[PDB]
Design a protein around this ligand. Sequence first.
Ligand code: HEM
Ligand SMILES: Brc1ccc(-c2c[nH]cn2)cc1
Length: 367
Amino acid sequence: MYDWFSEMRKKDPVYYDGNIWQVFSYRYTKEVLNNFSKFSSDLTGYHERLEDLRNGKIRFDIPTRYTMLTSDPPLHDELRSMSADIFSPQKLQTLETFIRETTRSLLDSIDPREDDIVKKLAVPLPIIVISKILGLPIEDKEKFKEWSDLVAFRLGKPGEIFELGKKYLELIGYVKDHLNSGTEVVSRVVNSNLSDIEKLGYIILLLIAGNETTTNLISNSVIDFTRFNLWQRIREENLYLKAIEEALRYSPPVMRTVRKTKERVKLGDQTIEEGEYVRVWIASANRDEEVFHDGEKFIPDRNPNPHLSFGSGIHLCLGAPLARLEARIAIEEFSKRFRHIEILDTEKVPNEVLNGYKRLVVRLKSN
Ligand code: HEM
Ligand SMILES: Brc1ccc(-c2c[nH]cn2)cc1
């Protein structure tokens, strides 16, 4: 991947293959993400469908097509304003003790002789925390893991990031069943003037959409710290903050995102017609030598680090404060708890957009 990224950054940072456009450089990736009025996120016809969702002309549709992720202002801003305070660093910091205690309890379960830390640590932690945050109970741990795994790039369905089918219908039933038992942010959504379809979409987005990405950050951090032999230096030079930021830059859990042009636009030397998909490679931008000195090197105290792994602009990841907090606490506690790590076996996430591990089997020496 990354050698190809370098080639495109050098010869062809803005590339048309006869179907869609792909962007590989930092400057044009950032330009795309921030220019919401020319590069639209409404890939599912949310704006076009809004009135008939709300007046009930549209009776049946896929709830997760219609969330803030696939909308433009003002609809986007109005949606996000209902939960933006909950996910701010100021408000999340209350949760620090709960997350730290949950982490150490997950660490307890680890057989240091041989264990899968994706299965023991990285997968359960985001699910437990978001369930706490939303007041939506984990009734079946296995169902919640399966629901979290529904998240995927979906070829030919732009904007759609959920695998559908029987599992998805079960998720919907679950949310309907616990609508009225949630915390205050859930109540905001439920009591709003959104259509039922939008309400379901919104709740599912918050409950499920962030689990695997956060799991992937934790897994990728463990891999990166181990492979480049940084555990001691990070521990002793207290580099947790900047090291996790560098893991974000170097091993982005979300490799790319996409936009659709609202009008003819110019991006660098190229002219993109209206109604074109523009895929923006976060992973490649994150190594742009014009922005990051020695971009191919993992530097645990890297500074500055304006990486695009949470995006940029108005859609800048709502969960970024939360993901940073969980990851930092997970790594800190893990680092405090174990002296030595050997990677015994790995299985990557196999598909296009998500970058992380299905299995991470390690041998550890505890203190
Ligand atoms: C390491 C973990 C994570 C990474 C790398 C990540 C990445 C991203 C990226 C790149 C975007 C922008 C997509 C775009 O511009 O089209 C985004 C948006 C979003 N993310 Fe995350 N994310 C993470 C964790 C989370 C978590 C934990 C949650 C929820 C609890 C979450 C919820 C959202 C939401 C709701 C949006 C839409 C924001 C909007 O449209 O205004 N993410 N994320
Ligand atoms: Br495919 C895919 C792309 C982005 C997600 C950002 C995602 N989740 C939370 N923030 C999830 C799946």
